Amino acid sequence: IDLEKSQQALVQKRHYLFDVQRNNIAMALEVTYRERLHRVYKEIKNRLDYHI
Amino acid sequence: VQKLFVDKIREYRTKRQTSGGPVDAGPEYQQDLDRELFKLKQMYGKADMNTFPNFTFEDPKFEAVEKPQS
């Protein structure tokens, strides 16, 4: 019973690490997205801020 | 004192005849407006007139995990 349930609960542990990998790389790519937009949003004010 | 009311408007109109900024600046207004123009740029930054944002970002490299299992 245990050697059956050792492989049973293992494959439910194998699929947990692929849910965690699929959202981590999807989010860590996404955190650089608006941060690329933020710096251009930053720079377009600073050239306006210098003139005013 | 409406006789003083006319006499500070009429010597305000004389100031409205201007050619190049200050009337009696000399070395005074030329040095001060240049000393102050640096200080609005000195501790602020080096910025041109119209240059857009020019850069490039690199994201985190997605490494893999090795796992002999079962």
UniProtKB/Swiss-Prot annotation, chain B:
Keywords: Acetylation, CF(0), Hydrogen ion transport, Ion transport, Membrane, Mitochondrion, Mitochondrion inner membrane, Phosphoprotein, Transport. The modification N6-succinyllysine is found at K46, K61. GO terms for cellular component: mitochondrial inner membrane; proton-transporting ATP synthase complex. The modification N6-acetyllysine is found at K3, K8, K41, K46, K61, K67. GO terms for molecular function: proton transmembrane transporter activity. The modification Phosphoserine is found at S70. Its main location: mitochondrion. Gene3D superfamilies: Mitochondrial ATP synthase-coupling factor 6. The keyword Ion transport applies. Component of the ATP synthase complex composed at least of ATP5F1A/subunit alpha, ATP5F1B/subunit beta, ATP5MC1/subunit c (homooctomer), MT-ATP6/subunit a, MT-ATP8/subunit 8, ATP5ME/subunit e, ATP5MF/subunit f, ATP5MG/subunit g, ATP5MK/subunit k, ATP5MJ/subunit j, ATP5F1C/subunit gamma, ATP5F1D/subunit delta, ATP5F1E/subunit epsilon, ATP5PF/subunit F6, ATP5PB/subunit b, ATP5PD/subunit d, ATP5PO/subunit OSCP. Subunit F6, of the mitochondrial membrane ATP synthase complex (F(1)F(0) ATP synthase or Complex V) that produces ATP from ADP in the presence of a proton gradient across the membrane which is generated by electron transport complexes of the respiratory chain. ATP synthase complex consist of a soluble F(1) head domain - the catalytic core - and a membrane F(1) domain - the membrane proton channel. These two domains are linked by a central stalk rotating inside the F(1) region and a stationary peripheral stalk. Belongs to the eukaryotic ATPase subunit F6 family. This is ATP synthase peripheral stalk subunit F6, mitochondrial. It comes from Sus scrofa.
